[PDB]
């Protein structure tokens, strides 16, 4: 059907956040989204969808995350160890290049 009420699951793709182990605390997670049909959609013929009638309206959005059911003493020792200066976490990009 041309009319589709849809549901879609989308991950975090930025290298630092997506290999991170997040320790106890409260933290803000905020993002900005694209609605432009010529970017968010793909057609086999590449025709302009703004002019030829495709449209999208986003009813709602939900967020999900999975947690380990770890022992509290172990959990405390593992939080303690990663808050130390010598034990900072380290990441790098797979593509790792400047684009021109």
């Amino acid at each position: 059907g041309r009319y589709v009420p849809f549901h879609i699951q989308v991950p975090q793709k930025f290298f630092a956040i997506k290999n991170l182990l997040l320790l106890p605390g409260s933290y803000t997670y905020e993002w900005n989204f694209r609605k432009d049909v010529n970017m968010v959609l793909q057609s086999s013929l590449g025709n302009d969808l703004r002019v030829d009638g495709a449209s999208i309206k986003f009813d709602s959005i939900c967020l999900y995350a999975t947690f380990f059911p770890m022992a509290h003493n172990t959990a405390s020792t593992l939080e303690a160890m990663l808050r130390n200066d010598t034990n900072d976490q380290s990441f790098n990009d797979y593509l790792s290049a400047a684009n021109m």
Partner: protein, 95 residues
């Protein structure tokens, strides 16, 4: 039997790939920080760059996409419950 005289036409196709020129003396992947990458002449000195590409002519504009392979690293420190500091490094080409 009735065959004309003929000439031969050769060509090739190569879809999906990126062409790669690694910064190594023998051009081998022997590790990511390369031997030219460790040498002292290059390291303490400044250099300008001039590359010249030949490509085939098109009947509408095109783009040459050059990826400069650099290191793009991040260090992550979380000092207290709810606080987080981040140290970003990109070399060559630092912002």
């Amino acid at each position: 039997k009735t065959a004309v005289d003929s000439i031969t036409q050769k060509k090739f196709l190569c879809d999906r790939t990126l062409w790669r020129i690694p910064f190594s003396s023998n051009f081998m992947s022997m590790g990511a920080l390369t031997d030219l990458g460790q040498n002292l002449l290059y390291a303490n000195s400044a250099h300008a760059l001039d590359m010249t590409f030949e490509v085939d002519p098109m009947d509408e504009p095109t783009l040459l996409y050059v990826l400069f392979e650099v290191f793009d690293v991040v260090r992550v420190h979380r000092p207290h419950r709810g606080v987080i500091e981040t140290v970003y490094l990109r070399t060559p080409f630092s912002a």
